Amino acid sequence: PSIWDHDFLQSLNSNYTDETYKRRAEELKGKVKTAIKDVTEPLDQLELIDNLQRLGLAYHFEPEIRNILRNIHNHNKDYNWRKENLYATSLEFRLLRQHGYPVSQEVFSGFKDDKVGFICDDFKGILSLHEASYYSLEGESIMEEAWQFTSKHLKEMMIDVFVAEQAKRALELPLHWKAPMLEARWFIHVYEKREDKNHLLLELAKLEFNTLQAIYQEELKDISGWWKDTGLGEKLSFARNRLVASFLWSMGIAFEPQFAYCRRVLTISIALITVIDDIYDVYGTLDELEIFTDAVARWDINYALKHLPGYMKMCFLALYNFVNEFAYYVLKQQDFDMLLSIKHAWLGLIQAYLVEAKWYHSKYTPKLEEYLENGLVSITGPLIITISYLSGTNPIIKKELEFLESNPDIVHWSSKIFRLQDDLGTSSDEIQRGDVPKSIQCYMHETGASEEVAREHIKDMMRQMWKKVNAYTADKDSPLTRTTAEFLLNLVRMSHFMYLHGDGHGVTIDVGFTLLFQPIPL
Secondary structure: OOOOOHHHHHHOOOHHHOHHHHHHHHHHHHHHHHHHHOOOOHHHHHHHHHHHHHOOOHHHOHHHHHHHHHHHHHHOOOOOOOOOOHHHHHHHHHHHHHOOOOOOHHHHHHHEEOOOEEOOOOHHHHHHHHHHHOOOOOOOHHHHHHHHHHHHHHHHHOOOHHHHHHHHHHHHOOHHHOOHHHHHHHHHHHHHOOOOOOHHHHHHHHHHHHHHHHHHHHHHHHHHHHHHHHOHHHHOOOOOOOHHHHHHHHHHHOOOHHHHHHHHHHHHHHHHHHHHHHHHHHHOOHHHHHHHHHHHHHOOHHHHHHHOOHHHHHHHHHHHHHHHHHHHHHHHHHOOOOHHHHHHHHHHHHHHHHHHHHHHHOOOOOOHHHHHHHHHHHOOHHHHHHHHHHHHOOOOOHHHHHHHHOOOHHHHHHHHHHHHHHHOOOOHHHHHHOOOOOHHHHHHHHHOOOHHHHHHHHHHHHHHHHHHHHHHHHOOOOOOOHHHHHHHHHHHHHHHHHHHOOOOOOOOOOHHHHHHHOOOOO
């Protein structure tokens, strides 16, 4: 139900678009850079980075964070550096692994007895180790045991008020699995409640948060009118207005001001997907679905208007012109012709939709692995990273695009996580209604596990697949740059985030409204 509709978006007029605030922000960045210089103790430097990242400010102080981490990496092999502080050792491990520096799981072996496992009673060190454990790689048995020990400890905390909340939040979403800006409002309030806070950092955080909101509202005004012009919400009564919801995804994929064009193409692509998804899952017959798939494969407006059912013509032509204008924009901007690539990615999505439609017609229930092979495409993972790269990169690198098109492993496993996480949003009523089988039902069918156990096993699979993704991310030799890989991971992070605050089983909050439309006072 679209409350935040076109007229609502056009009517907004945030004060923080103004030039005055933009001047105070520059003044504050300067003073913060100076205060950073006076932080010399390593643990204080690590906590500074952690604070910058969770306030949403880190993209403003990138060289300063790079410096701190480079210098801590130089020194962390010194003789008496390992200070046997579980919190400090875990914080350093997280941050260094987050930014691609090698650190061994062996930095934790001192906190662990071979017989009785991990020994620690300090909640602060347990919480930090728990966050660090999500940077594990495949086969790091210390990191796996660390997760087993910390998650067990944190579950028992909820059988002091801030301690319980921290444990609850880390159990439902570790820092590695959340994009920076999504936690920004919560952490800003934690931060200002601190005695030792830096007052200029906090004020910069509130100001940049409100500025970001204003920037997004302007984009939404423009995206909104474009969506109204296509009138899809009018010809098809099922084509609902999911514009704000789509923009929320696009902002989780790429929040920074410079990615405005990326957010625009992502938002419109996702809105079109929800319309197409409806046609393939619900309203179209198989023969119609077969014609639409072919029309996309041919990429031929004349054929499409000749052969498509009436109710599909506008949906097709809206996609067709949107993608062709997308290709035009990139041709004009940087002389790069990516039409074959983008239309290939859309075809792949649509072909995967068809497969699912044929399974449903035959009432076939595939085994999980066969479901996921197709479901990693149909969840739009491969399409979304291709869109994000083509719309978010100047200059587009041919070898990098070619790597994305070769179906690389980082995209394979990220999209599987995405698909599993989305499928966990299914409710028990539909699990027991039983018409269309997804991850949970395929797993139940294949193992005889109950729904409750199936969900738990599927959640564990996600944690294990993130171990592979962590390897591909630290691989300095892939064609994908770090910033390209962040688009992909932010997509996965956004599915983890929306499982908690979305439509389905993981949930009056409306975090979307809170992220986009509700400033932080002062």
